[PDB]
Amino acid sequence: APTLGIIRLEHAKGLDLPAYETAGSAGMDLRAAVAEDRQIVLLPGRRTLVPTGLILEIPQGYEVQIRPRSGLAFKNGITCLNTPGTIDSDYRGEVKVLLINLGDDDFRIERGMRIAQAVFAPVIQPKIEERA
Amino acid sequence: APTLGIIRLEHAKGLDLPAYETAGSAGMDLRAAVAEDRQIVLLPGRRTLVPTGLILEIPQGYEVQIRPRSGLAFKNGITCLNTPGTIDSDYRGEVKVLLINLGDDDFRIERGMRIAQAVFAPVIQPKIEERAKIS
Amino acid sequence: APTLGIIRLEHAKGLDLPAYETAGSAGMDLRAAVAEDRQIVLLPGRRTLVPTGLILEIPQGYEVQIRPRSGLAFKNGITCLNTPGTIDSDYRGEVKVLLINLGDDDFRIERGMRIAQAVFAPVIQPKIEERAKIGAGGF
Incomplete structure (x- = not known):
């Protein structure tokens, strides 16, 4: 099995590492690493980039x-706008989740909230051949 | 090849099992297993769960x-809100599809309508190693 | 490595083909093949099907x-409405990208603009077996 490295930045240190819940899980929940005293409200139609600290x-x-x-999408109409978000093997910046509120409630985002799921998947760079 | 088990519930009566159209197909189309003599109305901006009966x-x-x-996305602005929806090996509930109307018309969901596609894949759980420095 | 064939239609003549930025890139960017000195102005809430000419x-x-x-989603609220749009090995039509504007400003699509990314990966088909009796997936 391949190894996924995770660095917790300072604002993610008090939150758990991502992990698979069971041997059956497809993904790992990611949480909002906003400051405890900086909760936000995502208004209907609006989008916000949420840090994970990872x-x-x-x-x-x-x-x-x-x-x-899926639960947030059903209950509150919240989703990831650029889904599925693509994190490259090459990327060493912080992972951030772009949420959009496509429902009609004023949705509160708080530190520690689960906001997305990460799935680890193979990818290939094929030879690209122009043809007639 | 691995085997995908499918249970058809009673409200899936008369709807085929999902199947790949060809050896080249990446996915299987899923259909709406809603009541036969009713149209469900999904207005602009609204979302709803549609049963597949599977x-x-x-x-x-x-x-x-x-x-x-893709066809419903282009023609009516309809999509799956939580796309791509993740179903794991632990899940044994009925598969439901979360549609949202991001167009301007009333959209009518009818029994048998294709509403999504299912793609079956291996999933990898990598070893997670916490690191203090960029490698 | 497998080979991806790309046939260029007339309206993609003059444009760079899709290519990976680095050896670690998962995706390669696709470009709009709208006529030069033509524009698609996509108003808030509207969707449009953009030709790649490929x-x-x-x-x-x-x-x-x-x-x-990700940059268009963040900066402009632009996304692909049917994401992830599946292109299988049988598909020989032109690739067209279905953009929707979920932001507040107009979004102007111009020739050559990078408007999506394409990720190439293996796909499998399991055997399908019907059964009578008996996790992410539920709501």
Whole structure:
């Protein structure tokens, strides 16, 4: 099995590492690493980039997809706007989740809230051949 | 090849099992297993769960992704809000599809309508190693 | 490595083909093949199907996923409405990207603009077995 490296930045240190819940799980929940005293309200129609405080180190040949939580999508109409979000094996910046409120409630985002799921997947760079 | 188990519930009566159209197909189309003599109305901005009438039995090591139907996205602005929806090997509920109307017309959901596609894939759980420095 | 064939239609003449930025890139950017000195102005809440002028010949056992660019989603609220758009190995039509504007400002699509990314990956088909009796997936 490949190894996924995770660095917790300072604002993610008090939150758990991502992990698979069971041997059957497809993904790992990611949480909002906003400050405890800086909760936000995502208004209907609006979008916001939510920090996780994580840097991912994905080996060559793999990617991580950032997918929506189904519960939040159903209950509140919240989703990830750029889904599935593509984290490259090459990326060493912080992973951030772009949420959009496509419902009609004023949705509160708080530190520690589960906001998305990460799925680790193979990816290939094919030879690209122009043809007639 | 791995085997995907499918249970058809009673309200899926008369609807075929999902199947791949060809050896080249990446996904299987799912249909709306809603009551036969009713149209469900999905107004602009609204979302709703649509039953497929299927329980999937996905073997450990694999997942199913639920992806949008392109034709309904183009023609009516309809999509799957939580796309790509993740169904794991633990899940044994009925598969439901979360549609949202991001167009300007009343959209009518009818029995048998194709509403999404299912893509079956292996899933990998990498070893998670916390690191203090960029490698 | 497998080979992705790309046939260029007339309106993609003059444009760079899709290519990976680095050896670690998961996706390669797709460009709008609208006529030069033509524009698509996409108003808030509207969707439009943007031509790439490319046909992909993907070999069997693989698919291409059309996914959104993160920068357009963040900066403009633009996304791919049918994401991830599946292109299978049987598909020989022109690739067209279905953009929707979920932001507040107009979004102007111009020739050559990078409007999506394509991710190439293996795909499998399981055997399907009907059963009578008996996790992410529920709501």
